[PDB]
Design a binder for these strands. Structure first.
Ligand SMILES: C[C@H](CCC(=O)NCCC[N+](C)(C)C[C@H](O)CS(=O)(=O)O)[C@H]1CC[C@H]2[C@@H]3[C@H](O)C[C@@H]4C[C@H](O)CC[C@]4(C)[C@H]3C[C@H](O)[C@]12C
Lengths: 476, 90
DNA sequence: GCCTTGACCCTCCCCTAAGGGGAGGGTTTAGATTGTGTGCAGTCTGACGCGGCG
DNA sequence: CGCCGCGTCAGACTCGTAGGAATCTAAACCCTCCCCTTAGGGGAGGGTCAAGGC
């Protein structure tokens, strides 16, 4: 056994990946058949709940007047043109209505099963079928969460036996007939929850609407949903066997992308995501091999992840493709001319203007490491030569402080009103500068008078008696 | 029929169809909810032909909207005719 | 001089009709393909922790 | 359990100028969103110019 011998996650992955053998042309077909039988079982278990079929026939009468098209409702039929769907929808509606009234109780299990097997014929688009199964999951999980809030409160009270709290709770479904039997033992635990016997009502009386909103029994709903779970675990275990058998295909494709910015296991994992999508989308009834379809999705995922995350500064996919196209045009022009082309002629063989190609050539460059050795030494690196350009020079800070002092000096040599409106008009020793109207309203004076005051104060400061300190803070 | 096929059937740009859908002059027969893809139908071509017939007479777009959504608009064709002769004099 | 007043004036931002142009984002794509792929190294000497033998 | 060879880890000079590293790589569709096009119009916000009134 090779366990504990290597550190490489590539070797560990290849080691655990090679323990699944490749499928034949026949192995892919019956794995795909297992997937489609799992999904068919999920659908025939969905058919027991009626409102999903009601929503689907709502969708069809919306297709009738074209609020939508049935090309988005069904992908085809198995025993898309819109005339056969009329036949199948009519025969399905004639089944749903003939099931709706027949309620009894042994007779009620003939029509539901034949409607299930006649609803099996519709191979829906994934969106509608997923909507139906998620709708049923929400119905069953809210019903289930009040089902276990029934026991949530029973744990809120005291010690919790529910080994035999389930004895006659099954089947009554209308009232507290099962609830009265709990105090019939008169053990202390059977005390507690009973004084909460009123507060429990709106849980199991909210059942009062839902058993009138679903039509079928609590365990009937729960068990068609557990049959849905069995069907989807069959379809999910069969999808896992098709992904696990085809990981060599992903490595086979991913080895051709190995040095474009992403590492080999990164490419393998992105291609594995593409392969899982391919398994979800594959159709074996087209007669093609799984490799033929799956290569498209694996290559899509790998190239998309290279466009997404191979670069520090991310370039969008449209510019990534412009760069790739420019590069292969440059390769052709370098081969056919023996000389690296200039952007002028590189813009004439391409369809693009020259100023567009110049920025495309300036746009595709990867950052240098600041641990790059300069001089190819190991003592001085590129980061040692890069300067903080946001630092204020200490002579500039000292000039700023001297200028604050000088304007403080000249503003002390003005009237208190003029120095105030001139410290307020500008942001001097305030956090914000003000407009003529704000300075005026603070003084309860007009805008134009404040303009006059500040213009006069500026004219005073223009005189060389008050200006020779400040004129030193100017340049050529 | 997607917008690219309809733009080639109609011999008009795609952005023209986008504008006509935005203003409400020519609305696609079915818009795909998730993608947003506009799909068109022969009954949309019968209306784009009317749009083109009116737009070749120099009618403004809003005049075309008023003419195709509200009937008995013979005062608008007279306004456009008088404006055309005035522009001819000018 | 202090203070209003009515008339002007500035820049800046958003709007015009009918789309053009482009950026940046999604989606699929069905002959068949099913295990990577490089080096490189002329250090020595302590010193510590551990399988494996006794 | 005690000891011996093996696997592993951690250390090993500061001035000038040169000075990096250099491979490899979809396409056709659709969408929304943003800016752009005349020749200026309209308005908000903020200033400015002469009149005088005390
Ligand atoms: C800040 C530093 C001054 C010291 C200047 C002077 C010489 C410049 C380098 C060289 O030009 C080579 C190379 C050019 C690439 O274009 C960008 C990277 C390199 C390493 C440059 C980095 C940086 O710009 C240097 C170190």
């Amino acid at each position: 056994s090779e366990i504990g011998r290597t550190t490489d996650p590539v070797r560990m992955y290849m080691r655990e990946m090679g323990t699944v053998e490749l499928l034949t042309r026949e192995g892919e077909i019956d794995i795909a058949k297992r997937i489609e039988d799992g999904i068919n079982q999920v659908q025939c278990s969905v058919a027991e709940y009626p409102e999903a079929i009601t929503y689907l026939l709502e969708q069809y009468d919306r297709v009738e007047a074209e609020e939508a098209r049935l090309s988005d409702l069904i992908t085809g039929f198995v025993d898309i043109d819109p005339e056969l769907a009329r036949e199948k929808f009519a025969e399905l509606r004639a089944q749903y209505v003939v099931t709706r009234d027949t309620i009894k109780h042994a007779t009620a299990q003939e029509e539901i099963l034949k409607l299930s097997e006649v609803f099996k014929q519709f191979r829906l688009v994934p969106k509608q079928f997923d909507y139906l199964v998620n709708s049923m999951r929400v119905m069953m999980d809210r019903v289930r969460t009040q089902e276990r809030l029934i026991m949530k409160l029973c744990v809120e009270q005291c010690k919790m036996p529910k080994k035999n709290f389930i004895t006659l709770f099954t089947g009554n479904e209308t009232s507290d007939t099962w609830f009265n039997a709990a105090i019939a033992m008169n053990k202390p635990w059977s005390e507690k929850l009973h004084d909460v016997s009123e507060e429990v009502h709106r849980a199991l009386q909210k059942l009062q609407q839902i058993e009138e909103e679903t039509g079928l029994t609590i365990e009937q709903v729960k068990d068609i949903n557990r049959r849905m779970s069995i069907g989807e675990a069959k379809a999910r275990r069969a999808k896992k066997e098709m992904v696990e058998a085809n990981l060599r295909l992903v490595i086979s494709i991913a080895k051709k992308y190995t040095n474009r910015g992403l590492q080999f296991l990164d490419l393998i994992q992105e291609g594995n995501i593409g392969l899982m999508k391919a398994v979800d989308k594959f159709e074996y009834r087209r007669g093609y091999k799984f490799s033929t379809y799956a290569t498209w999705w694996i290559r899509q995922a790998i190239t998309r992840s290279i466009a997404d995350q191979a670069r520090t500064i991310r370039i969008p996919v449209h510019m990534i493709e412009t760069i790739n196209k420019l590069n292969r045009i440059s390769r052709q022009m370098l081969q056919e001319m023996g000389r690296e082309p200039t952007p002028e002629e590189l813009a004439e063989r391409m369809l693009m203007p020259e100023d567009k190609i110049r920025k495309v050539l300036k746009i595709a460059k990867e950052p240098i490491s600041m641990e790059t050795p300069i001089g190819d030494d190991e003592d001085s690196h590129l980061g040692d030569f890069i300067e903080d350009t946001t630092l204020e020079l200490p002579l500039d800070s000292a000039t700023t402080e001297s200028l604050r002092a000088a304007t403080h000096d000249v503003l002390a040599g003005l009237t208190a009103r003029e120095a105030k409106v001139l410290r307020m008009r500008f942001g001097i020793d305030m956090n914000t500068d003000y407009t003529l109207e704000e300075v005026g309203k603070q003084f309860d004076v007009t805008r134009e008078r404040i303009r006059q005051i500040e213009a006069k104060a500026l004219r005073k400061l223009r005189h060389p008696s008050r200006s020779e300190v400040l004129r030193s803070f100017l340049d050529d | 029929s997607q917008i690219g096929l309809f733009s080639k059937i109609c011999r008009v740009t795609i952005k023209t169809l986008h504008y006509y859908n935005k203003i409400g002059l020519l609305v696609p027969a079915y818009i795909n909810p998730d993608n947003g893809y506009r799909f068109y139908t022969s009954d949309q071509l019968m209306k784009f032909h009317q749009i083109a017939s009116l737009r070749q007479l120099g009618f403004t777009i809003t005049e075309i909207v008023t003419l195709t959504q509200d009937e008995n608009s013979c005062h608008i064709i007279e306004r456009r005719r008088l404006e055309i002769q005035k522009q001819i004099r000018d």
